[PDB]
Amino acid sequence: SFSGYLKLTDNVYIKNADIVEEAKKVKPTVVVNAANVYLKHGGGVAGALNKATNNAMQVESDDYIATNGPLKVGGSCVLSGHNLAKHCLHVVGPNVNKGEDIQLLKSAYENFNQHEVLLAPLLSAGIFGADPIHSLRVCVDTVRTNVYLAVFDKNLYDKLVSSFL
Numbered sequence: 562s563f564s565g566y567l568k569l570t571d572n573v574y575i576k577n578a579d580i581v582e583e584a585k586k587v588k589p590t591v592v593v594n595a596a597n598v599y600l601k602h603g604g605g606v607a608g609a610l611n612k613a614t615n616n617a618m619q620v621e622s623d624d625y626i627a628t629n630g631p632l633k634v635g636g637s638c639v640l641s642g643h644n645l646a647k648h649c650l651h652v653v654g655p656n657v658n659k660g661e662d663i664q665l666l667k668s669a670y671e672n673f674n675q676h677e678v679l680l681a682p683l684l685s686a687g688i689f690g691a692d693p694i695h696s697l698r699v700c701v702d703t704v705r706t707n708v709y710l711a712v713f714d715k716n717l718y719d720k721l722v723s724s725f726l
């Protein structure tokens with residue numbers, strides 16, 4: 562079960578943790594992946610989660626894309642969580658480095674509401690280029706289900722907690 566999280570709101574919790582190690586320890590029902598529309602898990606959270614599955618996440622994802630085509634920015638799909646979780650919810654937040662619309666971040670977080678409890682990263686943060694403080698704000702104002710946020714970077718985690726309104 563989830564331990565060492567700081568409570569931000571009634572339903573949002575946060576911890577300075579590597580989401581891969583957190584997923585291997587907790588084996589949650591749902592781990593969220595910071596996916597792209599192609600489910601190409603090359604880097605960031607996606608690359609790390611996929612590497613932890615020995616590439617099984619990428620093999621499953623390529624079969625999913627071959628059958629269904631790409632996801633929408635702001636959309637999601639549920640796939641296996643492999644050795645990390647029961648399920649992986651691949652959520653596509655806007656990548657502002659690729660010029661995608663930041664307003665799609667609320668739509669991306671709305672996917673979390675279909676699951677009672679999730680282990681998740683901050684969407685569009687990291688290599689996706691959005692301001693993580695803004696992502697946490699959108700998360701708390703959009704997600705109503707229980708979300709356990711893992712923030713890899715200690716300095717960012719401290720900035721997120723200390724600046725949380």
Ligand SMILES: O=C(NCc1nc2ccccc2[nH]1)c1ccco1
Nearest residue numbers: 579580581582605606609612613713
């Ligand atoms: O590959 C690993 N960590 C690197 C990593 N961890 C991230 C978390 C968020 C964003 C980028 C990251 N990149 C690993 C394997 C097992 C435990 O950790």
